[PDB]
Structures are given as C-alpha cells and as structure tokens.
Design a protein around this ligand. Sequence first.
Ligand SMILES: *[C@@H]1O[C@H](CO)[C@@H](O[C@@H]2O[C@H](CO)[C@@H](O[C@@H]3O[C@H](CO)[C@@H](O)[C@H](O)[C@@H]3O)[C@H](O)[C@H]2NC(C)=O)[C@H](O)[C@H]1NC(C)=O
Ligand SMILES: *[C@@H]1O[C@H](CO)[C@@H](O[C@@H]2O[C@H](CO)[C@@H](O[C@@H]3O[C@H](CO)[C@@H](O)[C@H](O)[C@@H]3O)[C@H](O)[C@H]2NC(C)=O)[C@H](O)[C@H]1NC(C)=O
Ligand SMILES: *[C@@H]1O[C@H](CO)[C@@H](O[C@@H]2O[C@H](CO)[C@@H](O[C@@H]3O[C@H](CO)[C@@H](O)[C@H](O)[C@@H]3O)[C@H](O)[C@H]2NC(C)=O)[C@H](O)[C@H]1NC(C)=O
Ligand SMILES: *[C@@H]1O[C@H](CO)[C@@H](O[C@@H]2O[C@H](CO)[C@@H](O[C@@H]3O[C@H](CO)[C@@H](O)[C@H](O)[C@@H]3O)[C@H](O)[C@H]2NC(C)=O)[C@H](O)[C@H]1NC(C)=O
Ligand SMILES: *[C@@H]1O[C@H](CO)[C@@H](O[C@@H]2O[C@H](CO)[C@@H](O)[C@H](O)[C@H]2NC(C)=O)[C@H](O)[C@H]1NC(C)=O
Ligand SMILES: *[C@@H]1O[C@H](CO)[C@@H](O[C@@H]2O[C@H](CO)[C@@H](O)[C@H](O)[C@H]2NC(C)=O)[C@H](O)[C@H]1NC(C)=O
Ligand SMILES: *[C@@H]1O[C@H](CO)[C@@H](O[C@@H]2O[C@H](CO)[C@@H](O)[C@H](O)[C@H]2NC(C)=O)[C@H](O)[C@H]1NC(C)=O
Ligand SMILES: *[C@@H]1O[C@H](CO)[C@@H](O[C@@H]2O[C@H](CO)[C@@H](O)[C@H](O)[C@H]2NC(C)=O)[C@H](O)[C@H]1NC(C)=O
Ligand SMILES: *[C@@H]1O[C@H](CO)[C@@H](O[C@@H]2O[C@H](CO)[C@@H](O)[C@H](O)[C@H]2NC(C)=O)[C@H](O)[C@H]1NC(C)=O
Ligand SMILES: *[C@@H]1O[C@H](CO)[C@@H](O)[C@H](O)[C@H]1NC(C)=O
Ligand SMILES: *[C@@H]1O[C@H](CO)[C@@H](O)[C@H](O)[C@H]1NC(C)=O
Ligand SMILES: *[C@@H]1O[C@H](CO)[C@@H](O)[C@H](O)[C@H]1NC(C)=O
Ligand SMILES: *[C@@H]1O[C@H](CO)[C@@H](O)[C@H](O)[C@H]1NC(C)=O
Ligand SMILES: *[C@@H]1O[C@H](CO)[C@@H](O)[C@H](O)[C@H]1NC(C)=O
Ligand SMILES: *[C@@H]1O[C@H](CO)[C@@H](O)[C@H](O)[C@H]1NC(C)=O
Ligand SMILES: *[C@@H]1O[C@H](CO)[C@@H](O)[C@H](O)[C@H]1NC(C)=O
Ligand SMILES: *[C@@H]1O[C@H](CO)[C@@H](O)[C@H](O)[C@H]1NC(C)=O
Lengths: 40, 415, 40, 192, 158, 158
Amino acid sequence: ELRDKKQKVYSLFYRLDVVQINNKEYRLINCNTSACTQAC
Amino acid sequence: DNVWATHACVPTDPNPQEIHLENVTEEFNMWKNNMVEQMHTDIISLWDQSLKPCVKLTPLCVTLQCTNVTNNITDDMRGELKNCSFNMTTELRDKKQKVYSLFYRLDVVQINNKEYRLINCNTSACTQACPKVSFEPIPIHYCAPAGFAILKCKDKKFNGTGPCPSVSTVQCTHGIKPVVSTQLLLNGSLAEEEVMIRSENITNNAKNILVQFNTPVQINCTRPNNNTRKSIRIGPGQAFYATGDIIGDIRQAHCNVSKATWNETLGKVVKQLRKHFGNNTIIRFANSSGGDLEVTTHSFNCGGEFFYCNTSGLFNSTWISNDSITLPCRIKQIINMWQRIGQCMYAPPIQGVIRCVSNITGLILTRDGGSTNSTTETFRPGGGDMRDNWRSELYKYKVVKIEPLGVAPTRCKRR
Amino acid sequence: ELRDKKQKVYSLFYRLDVVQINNKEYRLINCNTSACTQAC
Amino acid sequence: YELTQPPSVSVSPGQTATITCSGASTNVCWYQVKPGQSPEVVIFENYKRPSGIPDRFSGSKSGSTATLTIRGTQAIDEADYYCQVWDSFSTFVFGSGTQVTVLGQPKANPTVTLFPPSATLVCLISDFYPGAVTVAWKASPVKAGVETTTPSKQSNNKYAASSYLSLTPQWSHRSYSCQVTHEGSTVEKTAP
Amino acid sequence: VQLQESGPGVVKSSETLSLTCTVSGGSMGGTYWSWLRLSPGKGLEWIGYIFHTGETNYSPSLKGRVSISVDTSKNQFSLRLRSVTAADTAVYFCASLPRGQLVNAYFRNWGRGSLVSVTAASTKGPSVYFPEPVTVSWVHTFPAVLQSSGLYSLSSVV
Amino acid sequence: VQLQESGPGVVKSSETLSLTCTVSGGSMGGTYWSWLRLSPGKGLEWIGYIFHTGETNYSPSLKGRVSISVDTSKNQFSLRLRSVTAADTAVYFCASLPRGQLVNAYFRNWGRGSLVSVTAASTKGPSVYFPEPVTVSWVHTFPAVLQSSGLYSLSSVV
Ligand SMILES: *[C@@H]1O[C@H](CO)[C@@H](O[C@@H]2O[C@H](CO)[C@@H](O[C@@H]3O[C@H](CO)[C@@H](O)[C@H](O)[C@@H]3O)[C@H](O)[C@H]2NC(C)=O)[C@H](O)[C@H]1NC(C)=O
Ligand SMILES: *[C@@H]1O[C@H](CO)[C@@H](O[C@@H]2O[C@H](CO)[C@@H](O[C@@H]3O[C@H](CO)[C@@H](O)[C@H](O)[C@@H]3O)[C@H](O)[C@H]2NC(C)=O)[C@H](O)[C@H]1NC(C)=O
Ligand SMILES: *[C@@H]1O[C@H](CO)[C@@H](O[C@@H]2O[C@H](CO)[C@@H](O[C@@H]3O[C@H](CO)[C@@H](O)[C@H](O)[C@@H]3O)[C@H](O)[C@H]2NC(C)=O)[C@H](O)[C@H]1NC(C)=O
Ligand SMILES: *[C@@H]1O[C@H](CO)[C@@H](O[C@@H]2O[C@H](CO)[C@@H](O[C@@H]3O[C@H](CO)[C@@H](O)[C@H](O)[C@@H]3O)[C@H](O)[C@H]2NC(C)=O)[C@H](O)[C@H]1NC(C)=O
Ligand SMILES: *[C@@H]1O[C@H](CO)[C@@H](O[C@@H]2O[C@H](CO)[C@@H](O)[C@H](O)[C@H]2NC(C)=O)[C@H](O)[C@H]1NC(C)=O
Ligand SMILES: *[C@@H]1O[C@H](CO)[C@@H](O[C@@H]2O[C@H](CO)[C@@H](O)[C@H](O)[C@H]2NC(C)=O)[C@H](O)[C@H]1NC(C)=O
Ligand SMILES: *[C@@H]1O[C@H](CO)[C@@H](O[C@@H]2O[C@H](CO)[C@@H](O)[C@H](O)[C@H]2NC(C)=O)[C@H](O)[C@H]1NC(C)=O
Ligand SMILES: *[C@@H]1O[C@H](CO)[C@@H](O[C@@H]2O[C@H](CO)[C@@H](O)[C@H](O)[C@H]2NC(C)=O)[C@H](O)[C@H]1NC(C)=O
Ligand SMILES: *[C@@H]1O[C@H](CO)[C@@H](O[C@@H]2O[C@H](CO)[C@@H](O)[C@H](O)[C@H]2NC(C)=O)[C@H](O)[C@H]1NC(C)=O
Ligand SMILES: *[C@@H]1O[C@H](CO)[C@@H](O)[C@H](O)[C@H]1NC(C)=O
Ligand SMILES: *[C@@H]1O[C@H](CO)[C@@H](O)[C@H](O)[C@H]1NC(C)=O
Ligand SMILES: *[C@@H]1O[C@H](CO)[C@@H](O)[C@H](O)[C@H]1NC(C)=O
Ligand SMILES: *[C@@H]1O[C@H](CO)[C@@H](O)[C@H](O)[C@H]1NC(C)=O
Ligand SMILES: *[C@@H]1O[C@H](CO)[C@@H](O)[C@H](O)[C@H]1NC(C)=O
Ligand SMILES: *[C@@H]1O[C@H](CO)[C@@H](O)[C@H](O)[C@H]1NC(C)=O
Ligand SMILES: *[C@@H]1O[C@H](CO)[C@@H](O)[C@H](O)[C@H]1NC(C)=O
Ligand SMILES: *[C@@H]1O[C@H](CO)[C@@H](O)[C@H](O)[C@H]1NC(C)=O
C-alpha cells in the first residue's frame, strides 16, 4: 500500500504455472504475452 | 465498400440511383452547411476510437542523454538526428536495461553530454500507434436516413453560394477520402472546365480564399535514408519500437514538382484570379508566414511518416498584365494533430525506404490586403483549420427534410 | 514528471485524514481500503 | 531594417499631427504607450481601426512609407507611438518611437545655477518648458564623465533637469563653463 | 482574457532572471503566447513567443540567453533570461497572438507590466543611496541621477 | 503463410546454438510451431513443437539440452540448443501443425532450411585449409574430405 516499502512474501504455485528462466530463478508462464486479471 | 475503421460501418449499395430534378432552383451554401461539422466530429471520435487498443507508452520519458550522431552525414541538416541512450523497465518488474534510440531535434528539448527530455511529457504522455493499423485513406460515402433527402449540385459554373439552376438528388455521396493536408490539397476531386475560386467575401482578407485545379500536378515526396526498426520491451506485453542504426548515408527527404506544369497551373490561377479584382492588378506569390510548424510548412502523411515541406520554391513569382522544383521536406514523429490540449501521437518508424506519389487538387491561399483601390495583391498559402480541407469536397451537397403534408383548395365535398 | 527523479513536497492535513503507524510517520486513512479520486 | 521615425513632433492643440514610418515593405501596425499604463493598438493595418477607438485616428500608406494622421490633439494624445511591420528572419520589428506633445502653457526661459564643491561639480537647470533641452560643458569642451538627468514634471508642472561631472582635485584649468540649449536659447553661467 | 505578471523587481547583475505571466478566464488552444519589453533608450522590442505544444521562437538578437516554457496545468507560462547585464532594465509585458498568419497580426490582451530593474551596486550612505532614497528637508527637491556604477546622487538648494 | 528462418551458419563446439524462424502473413492462433532437422548420417529427425500459451514439448532423445521459446510481439519463435557436439551438423527447418489430432497430422508450410555446420577446428594452411577451400590450377578437381579432427584434404592429378 505505502508505495515506497516492499515485502518478502511466499506462495505455492504449481508446476504447470512457472517456467525456468535459467534456488533456481523462475517466472510465471504468462509474463511474455500479457498480464492477467485475477477472478474476484 | 486502418484508422478509418469500416468494420463498424455498414456496407454500401452497388449502383446508387440518381434522379435529375428539372424545374427546381435551390439556394445552396457551402460555407454554412452542417454536414461538414458532423464529418469533423465523426473523424475526431473515430480517430480516438482507433487509438484505444494500442500501447499507452506512459513510462517512457526517463531523462535522455543524447549525443550528435555523425557518421558520414552530409553537409546540410547537420545535427538533426540525435543518439539518445536511456534505460527502461523490462518484462520483469525488478530489472532494467540500457538501450539506445534515434530521435529528431523536433522531438527533444534540453533540460538545464547534456540531458534531454521529450517535448511531450511536460503536458501529457503520447500514445503509440500500434503497427497493425495503417494511415491510408479509404473512401467513405455519407448516406441519409428515412425522411431526409440529399440534394446534389450539378451547375458547372458554381462558386458555392447562391441559387443553382440544375439540382439532382442522390441517396449516397461519392468517394470522399479524409485526406490530411494543410496548404496543398492532395488526392481531391478535380474541377471540370476552369479553375474555380470560392470564398466567403472576396473583398475581405480575413477569410480563406480557396481554389480548385482543373488538371492535376504530380508530386513525388520520398525519404532516401535506409532506417530500421527495433523492438524494445517496456513491460509484460507492451513493446516500444525505436529507430535502429541507419544503413548507408544520411540524406534529407526530397519533394519534387514539375516546373513547367506548375507554371502553367499558376498561369491558370492568376488568369482566373484577376476577374475578381481587375485587369491591371499585379499579382504576386510569396511564401507562407505561419507561426507554428503546421501552418508554415506543407504537412501530410506518407503511410506512417509525417512530412513537413518548406514549399518556398513554389510560391515565389510575380505576374504582370524536364527541370523539377525540389523542396526540403522534413520529418517529425510526435504528432499533436487535431489541436487538442493533452493528447498526442508517437508514430513508429517505417522500415526501409518510403515513396509516395500523389497529385495536388486544391490550394488554400490567403490574401494580403494592404489598402483599397490598389494595384498589387500578394497571395500566401495557409490553413491549419481542418474544416476548410473538407469544405472543398462537400460543396455540392445539402440535406433537407421532407414534409409530405399539404392542403389545396378544390371543388369536392366529403359525403 | 520525470520517472527517475523525486522531490520534497509539504502540505497541511487535518487530523481526521491521517493515522499513526508503527511518532513521526503518518499515512492517509484511505490507503488500506481504496484509492481516492480527486475532484478535478 | 530599422524602420526610421522622426524622434519628436510638437503641435499646437486643435490642429493636425502627422507621423511617418518609412522603409516598410509590408503592412504596418501602430501602438501607443502612456507612462504607467498598458499599451493599446490604435491602427492595426494600413487603413482599418479596431472597435472602441475615437474618430481622430486614421492611417494611410503610399509606396513604402505609411503615415498616421491625427485630426484633434488634446491632453490625452500626449503619448509615444511605435510603428510595426513583419519580417521573415526577425519575426517582429519596431520603430524608434515618435513623441507627440501639446502646448498647454507658453514658452518660458530656463534658469541655471552653478555651485563649487569643497569633489564633484554640479550644474542645475530648472523651470523650462517644453522638455527638449540639450546640455554642454566647457573648460576646451569635455566629453568625459558627464551625465544628464531626464526631464520630469514637478509641482510647478514645468520641466527641470541637472548635469553632473566628477573632477580630480585639475582645479590646471582656470575656467569652467556650463551651457544649456532650449530650442535656440543659450544661457552661459560660470570658477576658481 | 486577463493576464497578470509576477516576479522580482530587483535582480542582481550576471544572474538568471525569471518572470511568470498567468492566464485567467480562457484556454491555451490556438494562441501564440508572447513576451515584450519596453526599454526607455531602445524603444519597444520583441522577446519571443511559445505555442502550446512547446514550439518556441526566439528573437535572433537574443538567441541563446532566453528560455520560454509553457505549462498547461497551473494555467501559466514563464520566461527565463540568462547572464543579465545592466542594460536590460525595462518593463516587461506579456501578450497573446492569434493562430494563423502573422503578416497582419497585432499584439492584443496586454498585461499591466512589471518593472524589473537590474543593478550591480551595494549599500552606502550619501556623502552630503542604493537601498533607500534619502529625503532632506530644511528649498527644492530634485530628481536623482543613476551613474554608470549603479549609484545615486541628488541636489537640493534654497 | 510464409516461414523464414535466420541464424549463424558456423558455431563452435560446446557452444549454445541459436535460431529464429519468423512468421509472415498470419497468426499464431491454434497452431503447433515445430522445429525439424534433416541429417545425412541419421535421416530426418524431430526436435519439438511449441504452442502459443508457452506449453512446450520436446523429443525424448534431445531432452535436457533443448529449449524452445515463443514471442508473439515480434511475431516469431526461436530455438536454443546446449552443448552441441560435432555430430549435430544438419539443416534445420521450421514448420507448423494444425491444432487437434497429431495422429494424422502432417507437417506443412515448411521453410527454406538453414544449413548449420558445427566445428572445433582452427585456421591452418594446407601442406601440399579449414577457413578457405583452396583452388589448384596447373587436370581434374576432386571434392574435399572432412576428417575426424575437423580438417580438410583434397587431391588433384592430370
Ligand atoms: C465584405 O467586406 C467588405 C469590406 O471588404 C464589407 O464592406 C464594408 O462594410 C463596412 C461595415 O458596414 C463598412 O464600414 C462602414 O462604412 C462607413 C464609413 O466608410 C460608415 O457607414 C460606417 O462607419 C462603417 O465604417 C465599409 O464601408 C464597407 N466597405 C469597405 C470597402 O470596407 C462588406 O460588408 C462585406 N460583405 C458582407 C456580406 O459581409
Ligand atoms: C520565405 O522566403 C524568405 C526569402 O527567401 C526567407 O527569408 C530568409 O530566411 C533565411 C532563414 O535561414 C535567412 O537566412 C539567414 O539569415 C541571416 C543573414 O544575416 C543569418 O542568420 C543566417 O546566416 C541565414 O543566412 C535569410 O536571410 C532570409 N532572407 C531574407 C531576405 O530575410 C524565409 O525564411 C522564408 N520563410 C518561410 C516561412 O519559409
Ligand atoms: C494519394 O493517392 C495515392 C494513390 O496511389 C497514394 O499512393 C499510395 O499510397 C499507399 C499508402 O502509402 C501505398 O501503399 C503502400 O505501398 C507499399 C507496397 O504495397 C507498401 O509500403 C505498403 O504495404 C502499402 O501498400 C501505395 O503504394 C501508393 N501508391 C502509389 C502508386 O505510389 C498516396 O499515398 C495518396 N496521398 C496522400 C494520402 O497524401
Ligand atoms: C526554404 O527555402 C529557402 C529557399 O530560398 C531557404 O532560404 C535560403 O536558405 C539558405 C540556406 O540556409 C540561405 O543561405 C544561403 O545558402 C547558400 C549556400 O548554401 C548561399 O547562396 C549563401 O551563402 C547563403 O548561405 C539563403 O540565404 C536563404 N535565402 C535565399 C533567398 O536563398 C530557407 O532557408 C528554407 N526555409 C526553411 C525553413 O527550411
Ligand atoms: C549510438 O550510441 C551507441 C552507444 O551509446 C552506439 O552503440 C555502440 O556502437 C559501437 C560502434 O559500433 C559498438 O562498438 C558498441 O558495441 C555499441 N554499443 C551498444 C550498446 O550497442 C551506437 O552505434 C550509436 N549509434 C549511431 C552512431 O548511430
Ligand atoms: C540508468 O541510467 C543512469 C544514467 O542515465 C545510470 O546512472 C549511472 O549511475 C552510476 C552509479 O550507479 C554512476 O556511476 C554513473 O555515472 C551514472 N551514469 C551517468 C551516465 O550519469 C543508472 O545506473 C542506470 N541504471 C539504473 C539501474 O538506474
Ligand atoms: C527529385 O529530383 C532530383 C533532381 O532531378 C533528383 O535528384 C537526382 O536523383 C538522381 C537519381 O536518384 C541522382 O543520381 C542525382 O544525383 C540527383 N541529383 C542531384 C542530387 O542534384 C531526385 O532523385 C528526385 N526525387 C525523386 C524522383 O523522388
Ligand atoms: C514522379 O514519379 C513518377 C514515377 O516514377 C514519374 O513518372 C515517370 O516519368 C518518366 C519521365 O521520363 C516516364 O518515363 C515514366 O513513364 C513515368 N512513370 C509513370 C508511372 O508515370 C514522374 O515523372 C515524377 N514526377 C516528376 C519528376 O515531376
Ligand atoms: C484500515 O485501517 C484503519 C486504520 O488503522 C482501520 O481502522 C481501525 O481498525 C482497528 C482494528 O483494530 C479498529 O480498532 C479501529 O476502531 C478502526 N478505526 C477506525 C477509525 O475505523 C481499518 O479497520 C482498516 N481496514 C481494513 C484492514 O480493512
Ligand atoms: C527483493 O528480493 C531480493 C532477492 O531475494 C532481496 O535481496 C531483497 O531484499 C528484496 N526486497 C526489497 C528490495 O525490498
Ligand atoms: C553537437 O551538436 C551541437 C549543435 O549543433 C554542436 O554545438 C556541438 O559542437 C556538436 N558536438 C560535436 C562533438 O560535434
Ligand atoms: C561513409 O560511407 C563510406 C562509403 O560506404 C564508408 O566506407 C565509411 O565507413 C562511412 N564513413 C566515413 C567517415 O566515410
Ligand atoms: C457567386 O456567384 C453569384 C452569381 O453571380 C453571385 O451572386 C455571388 O455573389 C457570388 N459569390 C461570391 C462569394 O463571389
Ligand atoms: C490523381 O490522383 C488519383 C488518386 O486516386 C489517381 O488515381 C490518379 O491517377 C491521378 N491522376 C489523374 C486523375 O489524372
Ligand atoms: C536497406 O537495408 C537492408 C538491410 O541491409 C537491405 O536489405 C535493403 O536492400 C536496403 N534498402 C535499400 C533501399 O537500399
Ligand atoms: C477585363 O478583361 C476581360 C477579358 O477580356 C473583359 O471581359 C472585361 O470587360 C475587362 N474589364 C475591364 C474593366 O476592362
Ligand atoms: C524568389 O524570387 C526572387 C525574386 O522575387 C528571386 O531573386 C529568388 O531567387 C527566388 N528564390 C527562390 C528560392 O526561388
């Protein structure tokens, strides 16, 4: 909310949702075409 | 039958009917008709509709650092292009990337190597024209709904004001391309017998005098350098197309008009001009006296690139009772087009060389009225107001509403 | 207006629009519920 | 270009006043200025005039010189006038400025006083009308270290000025003279 | 439309001058906002104009030491002069021009004009007076003289 | 549609290989963009296909050193190979498949085919010629022979 301070959060994503970019780094699979819209 | 999106417009009919009314006299007025304002509003709103699904490009204008690009550039137009080296957010929102782009002098200003910023983001953030969409004009036919009839002028000697002896009706207008111009009307509809002169008040110098040619004059504006485009990602799915390194040399954009044909056309114009002022008036042509760039320079589009031409070598002569004239046309990218505060354009560069072959149909001149009963009148090009650009194509049209009720005396009785 | 530079700006705010977070760090009351639209 | 103008034109109240702006290839435009007041356009082309202007203002052009004509000179016409044309390189160029004065009071002679210091030499010139006064100094005239006060209106409503000079304590010269010039009249007063 | 200026009346020599002319009761669409300067020894003289998209145009005599900026948010535009010498003392107006041809255009909607005096002097007292004009009463009071060094002097005699 | 490929023709041994096949006059809606390799010592082989959502599939024999990416912005898709040995010299194609059943699907809309040569050799003159095929004129000319060290050899007799 306060747009100067960040935070370290953790979450559980599935294997069919992340792609290795090459402890190993990762990105979401859908972040080279378009950003999503979370279902309310 | 692009920006001018006809996917939301209904298809027209083949062979539209035309009925020649015979014993009618209609009082036309090309300067007060209301379809021109509706055309201007439709073009503005449809242009804004076509600008909606493209890249916003709001985070771009980080403080730029630009050097002179100077590689084997020619003698003239030195220090026009700049080699700016800024850095940007990438697809991941925790990294950056140092990139380079080529920009013109007319797009960046100095803020104090010296730091530069774009000219746009003191007022607003420009919106990119996403490259699937092309700017070529296509014809648009204006119809009429039920109860309204469109009357078309068919007098061959018609100055745009007064009664018309021969009037014909039609349901559809002809092909009207929304061409973009400021001083020289391009790709328009020609005249039939002579060159015509239309104005509000020919003894008033505050109204734009408008002339329409009888035969076309061919114009060739081209840009000779071999530029390339590169894609720079500014986020998850938004790309900004910057100008790459130029292959070859650097040259300015030329614009060619045949000399003898233009001299003959100017002779036709000065012969038809002196019927309004006198048979002994010396007529001169001087270059434009605008304040901004759009009124000073002839401006149009060439399939993606926007030109600005000096046009001083055309309107420089006086008239007393295979050589081609070249014009140094120049290129700008940031476009504030319909003269609205806080909305603009970034036009992406077009890969490879570009060529446009067009022809000039009308001129928008402006009188320089010194004094009454004088012997010299000098004419200058001008414009900027886009309503006069489409007023030369909607002069022979008007809209009327039918009222089919009527009463009359007779001898009859109802039972 | 420049994306890399920042400035220091002072203003006066009433007591009903600010809240104390954990004695000299305040934030607007609307931050953890919404984002206000200023009436132009 | 320079757009040359006459420096000052003085006419009696009630008659005409003509000012000429020469060297104008293009259509002229005239502005007037009063002290402590915003300028106003008066004749915005060769012959026309905007709304809300009196009928005493008119202009005409013949060839390359344009003339402005005044039909009636009053106390409200005591103003400077600037002619303006358009040029391609420098976008707006203006004239030198013509001063128009009206004779509310008759011609009166100035009075001059001189005082020695104990090390600056003072020449005080007071009570003259009109304000067109040039000064001169003599010793062998001197061009060095002289400054002239612009004329101004006092409670007498009759113009006055001054002239100063600083001299190193050459007190070599045995004579020192201060000269005034008011439209022909010259008064000489002087000495160690 | 009404225009009003705002800025300092005393600027030290060889320093950056700044002025701001605000616009009230109007919009910045299709006008050339300009600046003008009235010197008493050089006559009326043009400074420059700016259009609302930042397309500037300065006078060629003062090119390189002037800067005009437009801002559509606070409804005002500003002038900046650099390396001001003592000969730039004048009164400064702000005026507008219509979009189109400047061949017959005339400056309209003039402002009040704020006098800006540039000096390079310091504080001193009269040896019978830069910061304060001194009054002597005992006679006649006479107007002051500005020297080339930027000081003042007067005379008074019965 | 028309598919055009581009990439370097000479890559060193144990170096990451790159290729890029672009798509013109079409879209990536409902197609499997695939990569195919034609080797002279092992015949035709399959590399892998990729769908527009980022879902990929690879051959099991080349799993662990292959990676195929897609980028719908610049309208192209790319291949990367890792730890390329001397036995991977071939010509490489890019093709497309219709969405649905792969049991009767056949590769269509093939590219030209960029020839990729792999090596680990260096510049050395012939001893009577790796970077340049030398020409001998005095006779008959015979084609060159690739050795196991990556060098060249020829003979010529009248
Ligand atoms: C077309 O433009 C001409 C000017 O080129 C207009 O004619 C002018 O009309 C004005 C306004 O009525 C006349 O001014 C008047 O003249 C006399 C003094 O000369 C007097 O009655 C008024 O004080 C007023 O100033 C002007 O004389 C006349 N002619 C010229 C040559 O300027 C004409 O009205 C315009 N036509 C239309 C249809 O608007
Ligand atoms: C309309 O045509 C006129 C006449 O051809 C153009 O005026 C000329 O403009 C150029 C602009 O570069 C002036 O050149 C420059 O002038 C001075 C010379 O002292 C100097 O700063 C530069 O070295 C350079 O040569 C040129 O003098 C000027 N000619 C005249 C007679 O004033 C004008 O630019 C054209 N206007 C438009 C809007 O196209
Ligand atoms: C006036 O009308 C002429 C009619 O020829 C227009 O010239 C045409 O302009 C279009 C759009 O720029 C050109 O199409 C483009 O051509 C090439 C090859 O296909 C390519 O760059 C694009 O895919 C696009 O199709 C067209 O070739 C050109 N025609 C000729 C004969 O040169 C002209 O643009 C109009 N002028 C205006 C609107 O100012
Ligand atoms: C539009 O075109 C006119 C054509 O007259 C340009 O005016 C001329 O511009 C040149 C170049 O700036 C001026 O300089 C002269 O050039 C040559 C050497 O290149 C030589 O004749 C002289 O030594 C001089 O430097 C020239 O004075 C000027 N005027 C004329 C009457 O030729 C004008 O600059 C162009 N305008 C724009 C806005 O591009
Ligand atoms: C613009 O400047 C950039 C550097 O900011 C130039 O890019 C460099 O060009 C040199 C010369 O070919 C190369 O050695 C560098 O590797 C390039 N660096 C990068 C990061 O690309 C660029 O060529 C310049 N553009 C011009 C002169 O048109
Ligand atoms: C983005 O660009 C700026 C300059 O445009 C970089 O600033 C440099 O910062 C380093 C220290 O971090 C200084 O030593 C350099 O002198 C700066 N460069 C210049 C040209 O002034 C900046 O680091 C870049 N990167 C990021 C991630 O912001
Ligand atoms: C416009 O006309 C000019 C002058 O005829 C052309 O310039 C010449 O073009 C040819 C062919 O490209 C060159 O070999 C010459 O050197 C040019 N002449 C010069 C520079 O004096 C120009 O190409 C024409 N532009 C068109 C047809 O688009
Ligand atoms: C503009 O370009 C056109 C197209 O290149 C030129 O038209 C050609 O002119 C030559 C002159 O010898 C003819 O041989 C060609 O047949 C013409 N081609 C076409 C398609 O009409 C035209 O001359 C140029 N205009 C100029 C130079 O004013
Ligand atoms: C948003 O933040 C405000 C300020 O802290 C919260 O409002 C207070 O919430 C606490 C929770 O313990 C209550 O005891 C107070 O009475 C609340 N004060 C007021 C003035 O409402 C608010 O609950 C937060 N909203 C969330 C987290 O949804
Ligand atoms: C961001 O992530 C990196 C990597 O884990 C970490 O070093 C850093 O502290 C994180 N937080 C920030 C910058 O607030
Ligand atoms: C870069 O261009 C500017 C503007 O013409 C010029 O003053 C400067 O000297 C140029 N620098 C170099 C290194 O050529
Ligand atoms: C300009 O062009 C020539 C000819 O193609 C090329 O060899 C050269 O590198 C370029 N630069 C210079 C400075 O001549
Ligand atoms: C147009 O021509 C008609 C017929 O002669 C005439 O009555 C009218 O005044 C003309 N209009 C203009 C603007 O010249
Ligand atoms: C003038 O331009 C039109 C634009 O459609 C073009 O088709 C035509 O060939 C040109 N010449 C004419 C009418 O002579
Ligand atoms: C522009 O450069 C490209 C890339 O080298 C080349 O293929 C093309 O032929 C060039 N175009 C011209 C008109 O020289
Ligand atoms: C002007 O010339 C035309 C064409 O010959 C003629 O009809 C007309 O009467 C002439 N007018 C005058 C006033 O001489
Ligand atoms: C413009 O015309 C003048 C004569 O009025 C001539 O001297 C000059 O060379 C012409 N300039 C151009 C660029 O045609």
